[PDB]
């Protein structure tokens, strides 16, 4: 920018998208990465490999194509997260992928966070991932109990129209249950 | 001492003051002479062009310069002309003044390295070349043979 | 295809230059070889440039030289038309020479020593202290220039 001697950071660093130091440590395992990404309304989960011209995604799952399996709830929450993980986890298996390390990008390793949830799911899907049980959410919060109880302090539906008034962590079970056998794209 | 001791560019360029100390100051009084307030807006422009690469001690630079300018007072103290000595004595020169044991010398002076064909002096005058003579006296006090070249001046 | 003629001795000449001359089958002053015009060969004669004389010879000239100074890979045997025919893929000297110039074959391929050991130039050469453009005898020559030298050493 200034002169010929100036140093321009790698693009993905300018864009503040890739932490290259953590990425190197990740690639160190020589295993596929379980990319766990977020958005205000959704949650993504990919299984990346390294490639000659860049990363290759062998299997992924998005909280949006979750409805395609009977999801009738919002998609930027814990129960959503888990499932997306489990979904990616499964397609993963179908792809012939067995083990992966958790790449949580520029997200913070907070306990009971959605990434960790994403990780829980993918693990249950059959994928072998280095992890730490007590950094994960307490199953109930995964199901979406923390939200159900939040609606209890109702007076006004937590969900603007949407589905239900008191919400349904059961809906969660129904979906998980579904995914664990047969069906298309899995 | 003789120009013989330091007139050749055979040694390495020795000018890093960050690594040299005790360098004697230059005897060159000024570089810009005449009406330095005015800019080169003169008809004629003559130059003193050195014909051989050599090293010129600040001694000879001053002696040469003085002899020329001091003479350019054929035009008067506040005459209409501007004189310029474009070279500066950067090359630090030593002397080994024990015989050849630990002989790296001590700074004794400085000199300017001029390459054959460069101009060491440049004057600016109006059809009134006393300057041409101011230089016959100048290349008289410098080691090389010189060429008095006139540039803008088809007023022969 | 150029004809190479070493004109300067070995004493004092760089080793890698001498070696190159040896790789081009020349081991004595006045010995001559016929080298193809390839990038690889080019780089070689450029390096040898100052101790040699080279250029493309005319058919006739090559023929004269071949007839007068060519030898079998072994022995005194004169390489004349008959020799050429009874031993090579051609029918006569001219047939051979042509193949050499057109770089279709070499002196070895035809069981001939790669070297044409010439005789000292009759009437002397133009000097080994200067190149051709200067009136000497070193470096690249004209087809008429090389012919003069080759013919004089015939």
């Amino acid at each position: 920018a200034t002169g010929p001697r100036y140093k321009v950071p790698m693009r993905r660093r300018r864009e503040a998208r890739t932490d290259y130091h953590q990425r190197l440590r990740l690639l160190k395992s020589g295993k596929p990465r379980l990319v766990a990404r977020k958005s205000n309304k959704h949650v993504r989960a990919q299984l990346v490999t390294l490639g000659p011209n860049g990363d290759d995604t062998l299997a992924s799952a998005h909280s949006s194509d979750l409805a395609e399996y009977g999801w009738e709830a919002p998609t930027g929450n814990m129960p959503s997260a888990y499932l997306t993980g489990l979904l990616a986890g499964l397609r993963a298996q179908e792809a012939g992928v067995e083990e992966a390390v958790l790449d949580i990008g520029l997200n913070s390793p907070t306990p009971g966070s959605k990434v960790f949830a994403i990780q829980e799911g993918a693990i249950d899907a059959g994928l072998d991932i280095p992890h730490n049980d007590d950094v994960l959410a307490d199953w109930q919060r995964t199901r979406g109990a923390h939200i159900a109880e939040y609606d209890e302090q109702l007076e006004e539906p937590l969900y603007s129209g949407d589905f239900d008034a008191a919400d349904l962590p059961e809906h969660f079970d129904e979906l998980r249950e579904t995914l664990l056998d047969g069906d298309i794209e899995l | 001492k003789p120009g013989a001791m330091y007139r050749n560019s055979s040694k390495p360029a020795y000018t890093r003051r960050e690594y040299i100390s005790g360098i004697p100051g230059k005897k060159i009084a000024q570089f810009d002479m005449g009406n330095n307030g005015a800019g080169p807006t003169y008809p004629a422009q003559v130059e003193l062009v050195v014909e051989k690469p050599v090293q010129i001690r600040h001694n000879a630079l001053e002696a040469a310069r003085v002899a020329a300018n001091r003479y350019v007072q054929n035009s008067g103290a506040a005459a209409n002309y501007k004189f310029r000595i474009r070279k500066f004595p950067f090359h630090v020169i030593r002397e080994n003044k024990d015989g050849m044991r630990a002989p790296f010398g001590k700074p004794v002076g400085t000199a300017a390295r001029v390459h054959g064909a460069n101009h060491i002096f440049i004057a600016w005058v109006n059809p009134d070349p006393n300057v041409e003579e101011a230089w016959r006296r100048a290349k008289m006090k410098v080691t090389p043979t010189i060429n008095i070249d006139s540039s803008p001046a088809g007023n022969a | 295809m150029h004809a190479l003629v070493q004109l300067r001795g070995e004493v004092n000449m760089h080793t890698d230059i001498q070696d190159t001359l040896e790789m081009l089958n020349i081991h004595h002053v006045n010995h001559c070889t016929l080298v193809p015009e390839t990038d690889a060969y080019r780089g070689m004669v450029a390096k040898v440039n100052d101790f040699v004389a080279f250029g493309e010879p005319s058919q006739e000239t090559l023929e004269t030289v071949l007839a007068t100074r060519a030898e079998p890979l072994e022995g005194d045997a004169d390489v004349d038309d008959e020799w050429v025919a009874e031993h090579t893929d051609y029918d006569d000297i001219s047939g051979l020479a042509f193949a050499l110039l057109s770089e279709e074959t070499t002196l070895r391929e035809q069981g001939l020593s790669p070297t044409l050991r010439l005789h000292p130039p009759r009437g002397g050469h133009d000097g080994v202290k200067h190149p051709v453009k200067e009136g000497g005898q070193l470096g690249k020559h004209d087809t008429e220039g090389i012919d003069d030298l080759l013919e004089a050493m015939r």
């Binding site: 010929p4 001697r5 100036y6 140093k7 321009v8 950071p9 790698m10 290259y20 130091h21 990425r23 190197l24 690639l27 160190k28 390294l50 | - | -």
Partner: protein, 95 residues
Amino acid sequence: PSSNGPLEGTRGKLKNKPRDRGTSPPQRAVEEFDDGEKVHLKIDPSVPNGRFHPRFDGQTGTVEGKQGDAYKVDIVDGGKEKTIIVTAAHLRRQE
């Protein structure tokens, strides 16, 4: 040389051009080579570990097994045959 340490006279080869400054791309720090591959040895000024002795910068050896993550490359120093322990961060496939 006024001293005989490994970095003696390495000001140039172990320094980066101002623009090549800073942390290097992980891609090449992870490259995988196979036994028999010809590889160019060059030190990444930006990468501290996995270095070999400066004297070999410029060599082109042959990967023959590895040791830990680091690789073991056979080079020939003058007339002497040697084995160099070097990480990928400092290697490139020839051709």
